[PDB]
Ligand binder design. Structure first.
Ligand code: CA
Ligand code: CA
Ligand code: CA
Lengths: 252, 253
């Protein structure tokens, strides 16, 4: 029947049942249990899934249980303190999408201030890591997407252009999120929050309008808008000092 | 950088061999094999395609990569020990149809002892249970989650997320189809076109892909209807093929 509507009180009842199950099963190996995501922020919608995190004392612990009841869905991640802290301090290309977890933790069980430590680690990441992540995103994603749509212009298929344009808009949102060091609230709010930030690359707002309105059938206009955004990227990185090394033909 | 420039396969292969000689110079007899994959590996590279290369190392626990651009072209070279690579080649994730075509597109450039053939044999010999498990996980981890997201959109917005969400659902449906038929899509651009040509699709998937491929994603009510129809098709299809776990308990551990 798919996911059903639930109240925040019903979801918190489920969360506390899962907390008791975790403590019953894993005992003294549990350091902390938290709720994150929309429920952690107390902004869960009628149909939201449930996301929980556990900090384990066991070295190298890294597993998860993710299931449905037919009516709702739960994901519980189990990590050692060291593994969780390392993950909280790594800035990947999709950091603005993934690390909102650490700014939305609602502690429900904690034997020693562990979840507060995780939050402090996540918020204290040095500026250089975002600089590195931005330069990596330009090479690994945006430059690659530019080749993809330039291939489409000369040989098709234009049937990929709507999906690719969605992917380019999301990559630009990651670029903006890394620059401003902000984690988007939900996947649904990524594009709306991205285009409200200051110092956007030129052409990004215009590109996102096609994506947000769903008007992705004019292939020529999309290709022109993608090229305009790609040009805006170049000027923007120059403005903010996100300079990619292009000097080495083989960098090893 | 003016972005990716037009190149011929001849020009791209010239770059590939320059990279090969550097790899052999630097790592020497620790290099067991070097291959090209992707579109260049398939001899179907387009004018603007990037370059992807793989290196099998003899070195214990070797696992690194170099990914760079010259401003005109972009290269990624992955270096893995044989055991690490073969383990990766036999692991089936939700995006297996998108990642593992690599192992069916190897163009051998250097090979000291049948290593690249071994990689290919490992990738093509994955047990059926791993695809069954990956499909059941994909249903929970992505499709069920997406259903909650678009039902939230129906009742509280934002509809500005619906075109992107519909694209993501179509892609997840393509992963489901690719796992079921054991097929790896050639390129990112051909995922949906290849997916809808497979047999025995969940009901509603063709209609959903029609919105995504045409780019006509502005009618939110039509998208929501199409998504629910595909979600109904998922229920019927997974049940008919046995991609079903017991969901009766609130906590299954
Ligand atoms: Ca790539
Ligand atoms: Ca790798
Ligand atoms: Ca999730």
């Amino acid at each position: 029947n798919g996911p059903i509507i639930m109240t925040r009180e019903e979801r918190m009842k489920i969360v506390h049942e899962i907390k008791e199950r975790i403590l019953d099963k894993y005992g003294d190996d549990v350091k902390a249990i938290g709720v994150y995501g929309s429920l952690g922020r107390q902004t869960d919608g009628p149909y939201s899934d449930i996301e929980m995190m556990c900090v384990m004392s066991t070295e190298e612990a890294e597993f998860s249980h993710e299931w449905t009841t037919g009516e709702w869905k739960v994901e519980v991640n189990f990590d050692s303190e060291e593994i969780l802290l390392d993950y909280a301090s790594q800035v990947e290309s999709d950091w603005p999408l993934t690390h909102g977890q650490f700014f939305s933790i609602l502690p429900i069980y904690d034997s020693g201030g562990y979840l507060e430590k995780v939050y402090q680690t996540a918020k204290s990441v040095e500026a250089q890591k975002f600089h590195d992540a931005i330069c990596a995103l330009i090479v690994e994603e945006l430059f690659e997407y530019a080749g993809k749509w330039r291939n489409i212009r000369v040989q098709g298929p234009t049937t990929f252009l709507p999906s690719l344009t969605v992917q380019v808009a999301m990559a630009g949102a990651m670029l903006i999120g890394l620059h401003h060091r902000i984690c988007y609230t939900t996947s649904a709010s990524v594009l709306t929050e991205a285009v409200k930030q200051s110092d956007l690359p030129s052409g990004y707002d215009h590109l996102c309008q096609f994506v947000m309105s769903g008007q992705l059938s004019d292939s020529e206009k999309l290709l022109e808008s993608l090229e305009n955004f790609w040009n805006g990227i170049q000027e923007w990185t120059e403005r903010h000092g996100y300079i990619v090394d292009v000097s080495k033909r083989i960098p090893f």
